[PDB]
C-alpha cells in the first residue's frame, strides 16, 4: 500500500495548497519527502512584524500507515483520507495521544 | 547554475543530519528529518509525546529559493548562517528569512 497511500497523501495536500490564499508575504509551501515520508502544507512568511510559520497539515506514513501529525485548519483531513478509500484502521491520529487510540475509530502503530 | 544549487543542497543536508544526530530527545519523540529536494525544502523537527504533552515542533527549516538559502527557523543557540559561511556559501546567498524583510538589506546576508 505504500505508493497508493503515498499518491492520496500528495493529492489532498497538494490540493489544500493550491487552495491557499495566503498574500505575497506569506509563503505556501508544499514539502513532499517520499525517502522518509514526511508530506507538509506551511505557511512561512510575515504580516507586518508578524512571524509566520506554521504547518497547517502534516502526515507521515511509517509501517503502512498514514499519520495525521498536525491539522490547524477546521476540517478533517483524516476523514478526507477514508472518503478517498483508506480504511480507518491505516489511520493514526499521531497528533492525539497514544494511550487513547485504541479507543478511537482509527489505527494505533 | 546547477553546480551551486546541487553545492547548497548538499551543504544543507549535511548541516541538518549534523544538527539532528545531535539531538537529546526522549525516545518518545521521533528526530524528522524533512528533505524535500524537488521544492527545496529541507527541516529538522522534533515529533512525539512527552506524557499528554505534544512535542511538535521545527527545530530548524532552510528553503533553496531562486538558488540562495533561507534560514526560515533556528530554535538552537548555534549560528546555522555563519556555519554556511564557514562551509563556503558566500554571505549574500543566505536570506535571514527569520528576520523580517525591512531589516535584511542592512543584515550581514542577503536578500532575494
Ligand atoms: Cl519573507
Ligand atoms: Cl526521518
Ligand atoms: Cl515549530
Ligand atoms: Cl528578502
Known sequence: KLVKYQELVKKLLTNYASDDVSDQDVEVQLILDT?????????????????????????????????????????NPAEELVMMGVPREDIVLGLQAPYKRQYTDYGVA
Open 35 to 75: 525517502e522518509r515520508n514526511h508530506y507538509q502544507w506551511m505557511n512561512v512568511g510575515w504580516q507586518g512584524l508578524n512571524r509566520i510559520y506554521r504547518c497547517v497539515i502534516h502526515f507521515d506514513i511509517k509501517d503502512g500507515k498514514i499519520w495525521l501529525q498536525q491539522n490547524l485548519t477546521d476540517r
